[PDB]
């Protein structure tokens, strides 16, 4: 019978819903202060409250819209859909939750919107020349990824202001390169030339039409150009039903936020579009550079992926900027830029290899926990993402939507979207904590029999000065009677120490450093476990000593994050794929790996005993990766057969193994083939 809300929610219809999901409370005098109150739905139900007066809301998980996920990107008419649920209805009760899932597919043939944003500094004059064959060739290779690709073009030359520009010391730098027997263009900040078009042959011509300018300050204006290309949808030509690839091509270090101080540029960058009718950034002389923060939010919010087509000697800065600009990718550009075709095709494939979700406009009282299905039916907790996917593959995320306490009676929209995808899941969230009979109440002084009090949920409720079992014993003094069940098992405390029994309910006289809740003064707001001198380290609230964690925290001490970037490796894999994540850290895997992400494994067998497993399946149809149907995504290495394992003279590991057929196979494992892993497997293994 008497379970939790028996002492914690009896004083208030809202409180009994706030206290536990199992509680119900009858009305219309079904049980007119009969004896039990609140308890469990089932106890009141049996004790004459079976009729729907019980005011027992439940939580719900419903889907409002589920347009089916699409197989092919060119499958227009009905909008090509990248995710399964579209609109979700979520109904919560306090301290409760519901599960849902997000199916995301790397839809095959999905259209590509690519913009080529070029460095127009003088060192690139030969680049503009080489690029005369691109657009046509780029799109041609991309025809394999998708049948529909559009190509645009723009450029940057840095802010046309005193310290960046050659200052126009004389007139001679108004139209520069007078210095070296040639001519070149003035500085312009950021320019837009060609919007994205399907007529990609226009790019070939538009790039031939361009020529370079002069920069005194080596750092590039590339960050204003990226941000404007990212933000100015209306001119860039980005269509929402397409991937947006912003290609940034450059031979130099970029200039960043507040460096602009040198030119008297102190205006904050609001991340807005400032490109006018002349297809020119008019803010180039007044606004500062965008920050890594602004770039990240705008490219994430608007689904733009950045590709850094950067020459080799500056890659260290671009790679480090991408770490601080999540979702972007950085490759290595040839000095003649002939490899932008390949750089982009691989960059696209890399972008599409990751599925990552981000939740927009998530309120403070709700916690969204994720378990991501990265392979087969195995899910890894604490993940917003999965690595190692191919185009046409799916990822399945399991989400738990939990609410702390009782947030305000407003409907909120939680947008759950893959990053880079237009499609998203809108979860419409409401909180059912209000007993209908809370509202259908007219206290009116009288009505609490003969007295002055309130009334709710079918029974009277006299407040302070009137109290009593119904309406009696205003200020104790009539108190020395009635006994009552003031404590479990009648152990005879007056009231669990901090309080005193008063006419059927206890009154807590304490009013120091917090609050006391419940009929028996049961709940001590201030009594819980400390983590580091503070109850649950300040990362949750307490209710009767039970800490209710805040967003992204778990555990009795609210000391464990649900955050994994602190345990994530440089290769994008949690625990480098060999270890388990716990409390923001990493648990050591049996072979002896160690460090925050299991980086080092000195007593670990050489790679040859781990790489043979890939060959054994991708080429020979044997091994764990065969049985587990995993090799195809696990091994992303290139494996080729050769007639001879030659004296390469480079970093090639000589690997060997005896197979099921009593044959000996040798192969070489070669590192860094322009960043790729290459295996050379002998065509003719030895055998008896």
């Amino acid at each position, epitope marked *: 019978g008497p379970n939790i809300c028996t002492t914690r929610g009896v004083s208030s219809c809202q409180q009994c819903l706030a206290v536990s999901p199992m509680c119900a409370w009858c009305s219309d005098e079904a049980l007119p202060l009969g004896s039990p109150r609140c308890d469990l739905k089932e106890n009141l139900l049996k004790d004459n409250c079976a009729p729907e007066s019980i005011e027992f809301p439940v939580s719900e998980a419903r889907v409002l819209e589920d347009r089916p996920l699409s197989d092919k990107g060119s499958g227009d008419s009905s909008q090509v859909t990248q995710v399964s649920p579209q609109r979700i209805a979520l109904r919560l009760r306090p301290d409760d939750s519901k599960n849902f899932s997000i199916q995301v597919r790397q839809v095959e043939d999905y259209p590509v919107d690519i913009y080529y944003l070029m460095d127009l500094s003088y060192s690139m004059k030969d680049d503009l020349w080489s690029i005369q064959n691109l657009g046509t060739k780029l799109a041609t290779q991309m025809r394999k990824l998708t049948s529909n690709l559009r190509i645009g073009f723009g450029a940057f030359v840095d802010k046309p202001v005193s310290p960046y520009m050659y200052i*126009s010391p*004389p*007139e*001679a730098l*108004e*139209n520069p390169c007078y210095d*070296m*027997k040639t*001519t070149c263009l003035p500085m312009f900040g950021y320019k837009h030339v060609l919007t994205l078009t399907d007529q990609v042959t226009r790019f070939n011509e538009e790039v031939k039409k361009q020529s370079v300018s002069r920069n005194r300050d080596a750092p590039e204006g590339g960050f204003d150009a990226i941000m404007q290309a990212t933000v100015c949808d209306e001119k860039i030509g980005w269509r929402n039903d397409a991937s947006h690839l912003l290609v940034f091509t450059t031979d130099a270090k970029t200039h960043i936020a507040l460096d602009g101080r040198l030119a008297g540029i102190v205006q904050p960058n609001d991340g807005q579009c400032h490109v006018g009718s002349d297809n020119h950034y008019s803010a180039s002389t007044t606004m500062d550079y965008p920050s890594l923060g602004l770039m990240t939010e705008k490219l994430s919010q608007k689904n733009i992926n950045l590709i850094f087509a950067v020459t080799e000697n500056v890659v260290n800065l671009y790679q480090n900027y991408s770490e601080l600009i999540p979702g972007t990718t950085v490759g290595v550009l040839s000095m003649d830029s002939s490899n932008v075709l390949q750089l982009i095709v691989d960059a696209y494939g890399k972008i599409r290899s990751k599925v990552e979700l981000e939740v927009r406009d998530l309120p403070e009282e709700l916690s969204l926990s994720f378990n991501a299905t990265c392979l087969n039916n195995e899910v890894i907790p604490g993940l917003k993402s999965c690595m190692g996917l191919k185009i046409g593959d799916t990822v399945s995320f399991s989400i738990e939507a939990k609410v702390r306490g009782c947030p305000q009676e407003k409907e909120k929209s939680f947008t759950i979207k893959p990053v880079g995808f237009k499609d998203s899941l809108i979860v419409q969230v409401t909180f059912d904590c209000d007993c209908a009979c809370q509202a259908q109440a007219e206290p009116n002084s009288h009505r609490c029999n003969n007295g002055n009090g309130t009334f709710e949920c079918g029974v009277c409720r006299c407040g302070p000065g009137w109290l009593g079992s119904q309406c009696e014993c205003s200020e104790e003094d009539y108190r020395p009677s009635q006994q009552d069940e003031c404590s479990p098992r009648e152990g005879q405390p007056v009231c669990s120490q901090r309080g005193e029994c008063l006419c059927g309910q206890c009154v807590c006289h304490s009013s120091d450093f917090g609050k006391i809740t419940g009929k028996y003064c049961e709940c001590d707001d201030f009594s819980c476990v400390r983590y580091k001198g503070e109850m649950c380290s300040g990362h949750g609230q307490c209710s009767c000593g039970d800490c209710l964690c805040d967003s992204d925290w778990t555990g009795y001490y609210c000391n464990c994050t649900t955050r994994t970037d602190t345990c994530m490796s440089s290769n994008g894999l949690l625990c480098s794929g060999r270890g388990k994540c716990e409390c923001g850290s990493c648990v050591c895997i049996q072979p002896g790996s160690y460090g925050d992400t299991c980086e080092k494994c000195p007593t670990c067998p050489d790679a040859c005993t781990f790489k043979k497993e890939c060959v054994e399946c991708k080429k020979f149809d044997r091994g764990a990766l065969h049985d587990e149907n995993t090799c195809n995504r696990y091994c992303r290495d290139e494996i080729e057969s050769v007639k001879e394992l030659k004296d390469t003279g480079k970093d090639a590991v000589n690997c060997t193994y005896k197979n099921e057929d009593d044959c000996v196979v040798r192969f070489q494992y070669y590192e860094d083939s322009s960043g790729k892993s290459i295996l050379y497997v002998v065509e003719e293994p030895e055998c008896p």
Partner: antibody
Amino acid sequence: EVQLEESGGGLVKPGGSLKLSCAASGFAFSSYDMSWVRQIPEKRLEWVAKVSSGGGSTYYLDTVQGRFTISRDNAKNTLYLQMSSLNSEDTAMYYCARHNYGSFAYWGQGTLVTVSA
Amino acid sequence: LVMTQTPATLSVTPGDSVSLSCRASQSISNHLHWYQQKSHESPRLLIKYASQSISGIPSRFSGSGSGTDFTLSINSVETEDFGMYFCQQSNSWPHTFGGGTKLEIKR
């Protein structure tokens, strides 16, 4: 104070060749671009050729190119103009000049070149 | 590029003010200079880069203009202002000069 002195002008038979010199002192010769400007009998000024401060870049009037060479010796503080395949149109007072970012800030006194049979 | 310079000749009584005009066929930003040439003497920079005067050149000489149209004004012409004037363009190869204006003093 900047001092520019050109020499080597004179009467040259058409189709001939002639070398002009221009000595310089009073300034860091190798820190500035040098030009030759000629004044044609109509009193019109015409830029002829430019040599960069380090001598790396050399620009010529299109109707001069392939016949004239502008060069300098930064150690000898002397500017040169070697003319060849001379026509009557090349008759003029030749002035060497020092640049100030596109302007000819300082000028020589002039060396007269007569092209005639 | 063609630099048109007018007027070709000018007769100015001392104390009177004059101006010369330079026209370029295309835009030359501010890459226009002015020179003076007195008898049996070489040309001298007067104004560089359309309005920047030089160091021992009188304030009476003031250049102005941008792109395609430039002026050189001389307030209160003095006897010693006699002689030829030339504009020169330093925008695009080859460098070009205007035809030149012959300034004469009225007496």
